[PDB]
A paper describes a structure:
determined the three-dimensional structures of these four agarases. initiated by GH86 or GH16B, which generates NAOS. depolymerized by GH86, and systematically saccharified by the exo-acting GH117B and GH2C enzymes. exo-acting β-d-galactosidases, while GH117A and GH117B are α-1,3-L-neoagarooligosaccharide hydrolases.
BpGH86A (pdb entry: 4AW731) as a molecular replacement model. (α/β)8 barrel with two Ig-like domains. GH16B and GH86 were examined in further detail. differences between the subsite architecture of both enzymes.
Residue numbers in the entry: 20 to 646
Amino acid sequence: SQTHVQLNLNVKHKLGDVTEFNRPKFINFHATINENYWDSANKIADLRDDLIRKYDVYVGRETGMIKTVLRNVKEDPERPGFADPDDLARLCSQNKKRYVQNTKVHPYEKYSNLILCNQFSPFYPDGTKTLKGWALSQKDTEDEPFGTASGEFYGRYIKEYFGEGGESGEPKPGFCEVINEPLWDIYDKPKAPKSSITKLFEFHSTIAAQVKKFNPDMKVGGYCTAFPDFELQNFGRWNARWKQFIDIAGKDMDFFTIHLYDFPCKDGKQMYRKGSNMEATMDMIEQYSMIKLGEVKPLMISEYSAQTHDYNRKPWSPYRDWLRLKSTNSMLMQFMERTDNICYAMPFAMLKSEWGYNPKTGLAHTARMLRRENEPESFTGEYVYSELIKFYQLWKDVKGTRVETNCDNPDIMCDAYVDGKNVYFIINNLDFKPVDLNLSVNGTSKDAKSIEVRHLYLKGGKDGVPILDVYDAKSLDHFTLETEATCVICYNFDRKVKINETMEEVKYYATDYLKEIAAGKELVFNINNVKKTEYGEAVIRLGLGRNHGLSLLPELLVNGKKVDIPDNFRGDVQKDRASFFGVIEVPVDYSILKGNNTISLKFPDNGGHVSTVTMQIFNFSNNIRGI
Ligand SMILES: [Ca+2]
Ligand SMILES: [Ca+2]
Ligand SMILES: [Ca+2]
């Protein structure tokens, strides 16, 4: 076959309160406006003007400055294991004054909404000494619960260092994550001590309270999961970690935070989160949050992209950047589908990291926006853009009101945004081969005045180069989207595009989750208080975590009526992964749904779990399909 992709530019796609592309939320990177790196060693004279203003790119996230203050602050004489309030204020006040004097950056504050976070040590109270020769208190009583001193430091740090902008000081962070990737240091890294997981989650509650004692309106979140791999140990990992975190600390967090990395080359193997896998990870967090807390917590993805194991001890290459680009684009498309429940998604790329270069090995930082002119041959010359800039060039100008798009291949993701006379049409390929697309654009009488095509793909296969092919077109009824590629098609119209209909997406959750599968035994899920309109469509989302060999085509009954499951689902079959974990998206005849709904699953074999059953309802303002 060939793939049909349809854009209905007169139909607004509403999800919760969101109807627009949020550039600050999505088009950003892991940096700050006041990094030293901006103003020296670069081929471009005013790099902030080029990267931040011209491309319209937002920031950021920063752990270094708070780490430095913590490691050099005097111990409290009146209390052992606590930072001294007067010296903390002193050091924080030195930094503030330096920010106050740094007037070149004050006009860039409007591009900045800081995610603040602590690196694991010395902040976690495990006894690790600071450079001043003392550890943070490891007490755990009802009067001084675990992390009280850590929390007081964090709380004080925020109150003392930050101002309101410009000559009053650096603006307060929009978000304060508790601690970076804590279970990686605690339990999973080689030679990890395996201290209490439970105590890490209590730690979060105690940090939040301490932070709010000094800054009552500051948002706090956790636990900043390095590797959210819920299906492991037959869902024991879920049970021991995210489940317990939600039970213990969920109610005290203003937001939840995780990291999501694809593994496109780990010992020659390809293990992806892009596609059905990350959908299952995110559905599970939301569904259990609904069951236990009665709400979906806003989700932050403070780092995402690919981790490139096989290339991480290699010099920089365009190819290594490509591996990151393809993961970033697909993940961003998936985050955009949940925009109402994502507060922030940040691709992991730093500006430069001149100090992350190791002179012994000759290895530069593996995710940089800028690299030296003579890399890979030598680490010399002035800094120029890496290939990672291609993401920000690809997404340039994209903004406006979201409009409905659909596609008959679940390995092809699409979306679109309308800004006055311009329309941005974004298409992403999850499949590992080229896909020939037929494009239809409906809802306008008049043809576009011009068309610009941006196509980001890999030339030359393995160890090749990414290309960003930008060209003008008078017509584009067909288009070949390359392997794992993305295109952004910008239509320019003579008159303002008229949006006169609305498709409202609403996501419904089940009463229960996480059910063992036994052959021949019905698993029944209940989704209630569903609101329908005369015209609509719907999708049922089956979260399945099963060993390979086991069936991903159960008999499905919705309110006693039979619904077919398609062969093809979103993304890959997960061959190199240890087991299958993913959401199979099932279209369902809208006429079958009602207020309370019975979803019944029967598999022919034993083992594994149905992690979640959720449902997307799409309610139309009119008969937009013409049925
Ligand atoms: Ca996990
Ligand atoms: Ca759609
Ligand atoms: Ca597929």
